[PDB]
Amino acid sequence: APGASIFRCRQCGQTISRRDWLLPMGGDHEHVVFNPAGMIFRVWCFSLAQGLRLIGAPSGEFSWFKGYDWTIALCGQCGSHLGWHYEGGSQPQTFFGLIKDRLAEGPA
Ligand SMILES: O=C1CC[C@H](N2C(=O)c3ccccc3C2=O)C(=O)N1
Ligand SMILES: [Zn+2]
């Protein structure tokens, strides 16, 4: 009965990811970043996620992760901005960067 195994959308409960899918990009699954508007995000990298809607076409503008282009990732149920999908890079080609405090962790 593990209580710390799946991540859901904090706003609505949509299933998003799993602790097992955390990905240590450059040696750490956690990355702290800012956007051009100065908003700070504590980003958890995941190899895999579900339940999202990836919006529009990829962009390399202001990418936090060298060699990757991003798309906004919304909660596919409620529209909450949960993070970004990264693509176009190498080892891995793709991953998800999700905002830790916009997820809730709990049992499967
Ligand atoms: O890797 C990324 C993901 C997108 C992120 N980003 C934002 O969070 C944002 C908000 C408003 C205008 C432009 C941006 C932007 O590039 C950013 O700064 N880097
Ligand atoms: Zn949601």
**Experimental approach taken:** X-ray
Assign 68 to helix, strand or coil: coil
- Does the C-beta of 62 come closer than 6 Å to ligand 1? yes
- The structure was resolved to a resolution in Å of 1.5
Number of domains present in the structure of the chain = 1
Q: Give the residues across from 95 on adjacent strands.
A: 86
Nearest alpha-carbon partner for 48 in 24, 25, 28, 21? 21
CA distance 24 to 64: 15
Taking the alpha carbons of 21, 25, 27, 30 in that order, is the dihedral positive or negative? negative
β-strand 6-9 against 15-18: which pairing, if any? antiparallel
- Does the C-beta of 70 come closer than 6 Å to ligand 1? yes
CA count, 13 A, side-chain hemisphere, 58? 14
- Contacts of residue 96, defined as CB under 8 A and 6 or more positions apart, other chains included, come to 17, 45, 46, 47, 48, 49, 52, 73, 83, 84, 85, 86
Atom of ligand 1 nearest to the CA of 86: 1
Q: What's the domain range around 39? A: 1-108
